Amino acid sequence: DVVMTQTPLSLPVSLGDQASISCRSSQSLVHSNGNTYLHWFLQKPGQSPKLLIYKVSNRFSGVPERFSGSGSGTDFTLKISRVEAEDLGVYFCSQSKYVPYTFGGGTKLEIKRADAAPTVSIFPPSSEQLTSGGASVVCFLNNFYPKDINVKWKIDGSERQNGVLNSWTDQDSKDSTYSMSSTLTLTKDEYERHNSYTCEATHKTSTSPIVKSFNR
Amino acid sequence: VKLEESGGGLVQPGGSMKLSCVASGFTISNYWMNWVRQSPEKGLDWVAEIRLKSNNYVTHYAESVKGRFTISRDDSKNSVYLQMNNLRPEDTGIYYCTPIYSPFAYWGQGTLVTVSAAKTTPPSVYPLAPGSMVTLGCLVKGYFPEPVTVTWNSGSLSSGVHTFPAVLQSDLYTLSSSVTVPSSTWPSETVTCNVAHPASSTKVDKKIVPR
Numbered sequence A: 001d002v003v004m005t006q007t008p009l010s011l012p013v014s015l016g017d018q019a020s021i022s023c024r025s026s027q028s029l030v031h032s033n034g035n036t037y038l039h040w041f042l043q044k045p046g047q048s049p050k051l052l053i054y055k056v057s058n059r060f061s062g063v064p065e066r067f068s069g070s071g072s073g074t075d076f077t078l079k080i081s082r083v084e085a086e087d088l089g090v091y092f093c094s095q096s097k098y099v100p101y102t103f104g105g106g107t108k109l110e111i112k113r114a115d116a117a118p119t120v121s122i123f124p125p126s127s128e129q130l131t132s133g134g135a136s137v138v139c140f141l142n143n144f145y146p147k148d149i150n151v152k153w154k155i156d157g158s159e160r161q162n163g164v165l166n167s168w169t170d171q172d173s174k175d176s177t178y179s180m181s182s183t184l185t186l187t188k189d190e191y192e193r194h195n196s197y198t199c200e201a202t203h204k205t206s207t208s209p210i211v212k213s214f215n216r
Numbered sequence B: 001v002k003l004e005e006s007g008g009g010l011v012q013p014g015g016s017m018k019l020s021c022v023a024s025g026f027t028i029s030n031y032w033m034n035w036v037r038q039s040p041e042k043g044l045d046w047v048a049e050i051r052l053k054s055n056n057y058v059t060h061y062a063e064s065v066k067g068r069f070t071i072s073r074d075d076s077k078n079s080v081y082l083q084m085n086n087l088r089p090e091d092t093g094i095y096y097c098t099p100i101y102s103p104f105a106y107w108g109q110g111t112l113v114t115v116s117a118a119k120t121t122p123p124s125v126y127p128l129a130p131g132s133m134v135t136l137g138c139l140v141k142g143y144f145p146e147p148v149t150v151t152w153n154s155g156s157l158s159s160g161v162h163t164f165p166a167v168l169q170s171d172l173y174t175l176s177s178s179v180t181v182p183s184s185t186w187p188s189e190t191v192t193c194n195v196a197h198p199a200s201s202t203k204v205d206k207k208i209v210p211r
């Protein structure tokens, strides 16, 4: 099978700047007929992949001129000029000269924006969950930038690592921020063995972590 | 102009499932039709192709699905199909159909195929109320399979909402959603999260009340 390799794996780019994505194929994608069967797809978060450029450089319908493709043989480049917020997502190269058709692993375009501190909210288990025997403590960490963040759960001053389920969003198309949900799930018994619950967020926007807590 | 996939769902390993892909606003009879699947672990994975009546309906398959999957077309119904037999857990993923070398080379919204022995389980829906802006939430726990749909005030409340990607630990999914509104909005006005889990025929409304 033809291997498709993309670099870089992720690409932060400021609004209005140009982005360049590289795709390398293990075999030449030039057919006997003269066409080069290399294509670029974009998959925005929550969406299906969409065709951007077919046969190296041809824009598919509805694709603006700020998107352009180039290259030959086994080396190709997608250039996004004047990057817009709405251009975030994962860019895939693909070949259709040989069966099986194969895809690159994707390159994620991240839009640089001003740093933003996470808005942090913590929630005790609902009465309803408690009745059923479960006890989840939920912490939302919303609209932050850059994406890297670290969340620590503390119970009575002690860090708990087990029972934690975290979910991270993709970058938001509208404001270029990120959000995160952290749930510490205990049983009703374990939760009632303790009173003090703390969600602790480490992010570049603050030298000391953001701390949200409650006492049971 | 659109492509619409259907036929997916939860199916036990060794099982069988038939996907449909129906086109609107154009005729598929003129274009090579492809199935492609997506998973977090493998990314985009080409599955099968069927060419034209004029190509003698020649087909091609990925090696991983040969002998098990069958791609077919019915131009008279403007549709392509994927019959899948002896399904494996690794066949799990979102399945798309697309015309290639075509003005109408769109992928549609896809159909989710879940191949697992795990049983269908309804979600528990728990309201998240606080102990200038106020953040409220809804915890949707212990369901299977995907998907669920979560909205707030039947979708009227869209700004300031974060619905997080479902997380699968073992055989149960957990999802949460948060909504942030001005302190003057709640609890003076109603804020209710609506959760739908078609697979278990579940619809739940949780009004967020103080305390």
Ligand SMILES: CCCCC/C=C\C\C=C/C=C/C=C/[C@@H](SC[C@H](NC(=O)CC[C@H](N)C(=O)O)C(=O)NCC(=O)O)[C@@H](O)CCCC(=O)O
Pocket: A035, A039, A051, A054, A055, A058, A059, A060, A061, A062, A094, A095, A096, A101, B034, B035, B036, B046, B098, B099, B100, B101, B102, B103, B104, B105
């Ligand atoms: C499932 C995974 C598969 C991976 C991807 C596979 C295939 C590529 C996918 C889609 C191709 C879509 C092509 C659409 C062509 S119509 C099809 C196009 N025909 C042409 O003549 C190409 C255009 C010409 N080379 C040019 O750009 O000047 C073509 O590709 N012909 C076949 C050939 O040249 O060999 C036009 O309708 C574009 C419309 C442009 C517009 O409206 O502005």
